[PDB]
Amino acid sequence: GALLGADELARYFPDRNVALFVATWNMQGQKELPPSLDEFLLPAEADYAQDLYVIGVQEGCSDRREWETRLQETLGPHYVLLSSAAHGVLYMSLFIRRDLIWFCSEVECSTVTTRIVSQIKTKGALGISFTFFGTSFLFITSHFTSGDGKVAERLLDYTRTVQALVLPRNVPDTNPYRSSAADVTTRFDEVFWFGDFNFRLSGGRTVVDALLCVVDVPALLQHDQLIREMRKGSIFKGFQEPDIHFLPSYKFDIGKDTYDSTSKQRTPSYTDRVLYRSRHKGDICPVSYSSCPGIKTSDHRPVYGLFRVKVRPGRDNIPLAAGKFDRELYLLGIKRRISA
Ligand SMILES: [Cl-]
Ligand SMILES: [Cl-]
Ligand SMILES: [Cl-]
């Protein structure tokens, strides 16, 4: 049958569910990476093999290749880099099980800059999309406008991004009649948008400090701007977020578990989030959603979600990856594992 058809799908996914790991991390431009990425990429409850890893980074380390090399080395030879992209120091890397490269369309990327901050600094989005068998996926990572009082600007970051991301292009929309011209996130079966959205907890440092003294997370989240704005429909229309059971992932003193003890007294906040949307209700099942407290090189902790996503058979008359991946990186990862 077709490379991307029902027979192949049966061989590789009898239950038609794909295991996806999606993470976002703001690195604060740090030069030295954590000693081990094992706790980042293989979290404790990730007690089963992931099919796809998608890693979005904001304020990324200058040596993008070294970061990708360490990811490749940690995942090991069962995974290959299906795609990676950069828009300034905003990065995204997509690693997939090597036997699954055959079922992917060509991978397409797009970028949007939503705010010029200075001559050398901007905020924006990086989107990567491809079809897997017959099901299309769109991954967007973003760094939104910063500041407690800048919700209105964050709304504009959302709107500018869904209006401007030029995806898909060569690879056909899988359900075009369902698509809207004004929102790129309507053009795909499964959408994940993860980043430093910079939404904060309202109420001020003193009130949030009081709440953090067991922590009642639900009560804490009553102060979250992002849940508030999503609830009234002003942002991320059609998206959901998994339940949060972890503590705020920002702002931390470097290398420590204490929240910003400088005079600026930034209110601990859930700046880093993973959101999902699907064309078909129920296609995406969150399995776990958490931060990685052991990664402490940056003022932000990484945040990741594990998901199970439904996939459907496809056809071969689209532009195909057909075994295309970063072979040089793959070899570098092999080389590093021989060394260590
Ligand atoms: Cl960035
Ligand atoms: Cl573009
Ligand atoms: Cl900003």
Curated annotation (Swiss-Prot):
Give the recorded effect for residue 193 to R: In JBTS1; uncertain significance
> Among the record's GO biological process terms, what is one?
negative regulation of translation
Query: Where does it reside?
Result: Cytoplasm, Cytoskeleton, Cilium axoneme; Golgi apparatus, Golgi stack membrane; Cell membrane; Cell projection, Ruffle
Give the reactions, separated by semicolons, that this protein catalyses: a 1,2-diacyl-sn-glycero-3-phospho-(1D-myo-inositol-4,5-bisphosphate) + H2O = a 1,2-diacyl-sn-glycero-3-phospho-(1D-myo-inositol 4-phosphate) + phosphate; a 1,2-diacyl-sn-glycero-3-phospho-(1D-myo-inositol-3,4,5-trisphosphate) + H2O = a 1,2-diacyl-sn-glycero-3-phospho-(1D-myo-inositol-3,4-bisphosphate) + phosphate; a 1,2-diacyl-sn-glycero-3-phospho-(1D-myo-inositol-3,5-bisphosphate) + H2O = a 1,2-diacyl-sn-glycero-3-phospho-(1D-myo-inositol-3-phosphate) + phosphate
Q: Which GO terms describe its molecular function?
A: inositol-polyphosphate 5-phosphatase activity; phosphatidylinositol-3,4,5-trisphosphate 3-phosphatase activity; phosphatidylinositol-3,4,5-trisphosphate 5-phosphatase activity; phosphatidylinositol-3,5-bisphosphate 5-phosphatase activity; phosphatidylinositol-4,5-bisphosphate 5-phosphatase activity
Kindly state the tissue distribution recorded for this protein.
Answer: Detected in brain, heart, pancreas, testis and spleen.
**UniProt function note:** Phosphatidylinositol (PtdIns) phosphatase that specifically hydrolyzes the 5-phosphate of phosphatidylinositol-3,4,5-trisphosphate (PtdIns(3,4,5)P3), phosphatidylinositol 4,5-bisphosphate (PtdIns(4,5)P2) and phosphatidylinositol 3,5-bisphosphate (PtdIns(3,5)P2). Specific for lipid substrates, inactive towards water soluble inositol phosphates. Plays an essential role in the primary cilium by controlling ciliary growth and phosphoinositide 3-kinase (PI3K) signaling and stability.
Q: What protein am I looking at?
A: Phosphatidylinositol polyphosphate 5-phosphatase type IV
Part of the full-length chain shown: 282 to 623 of 644
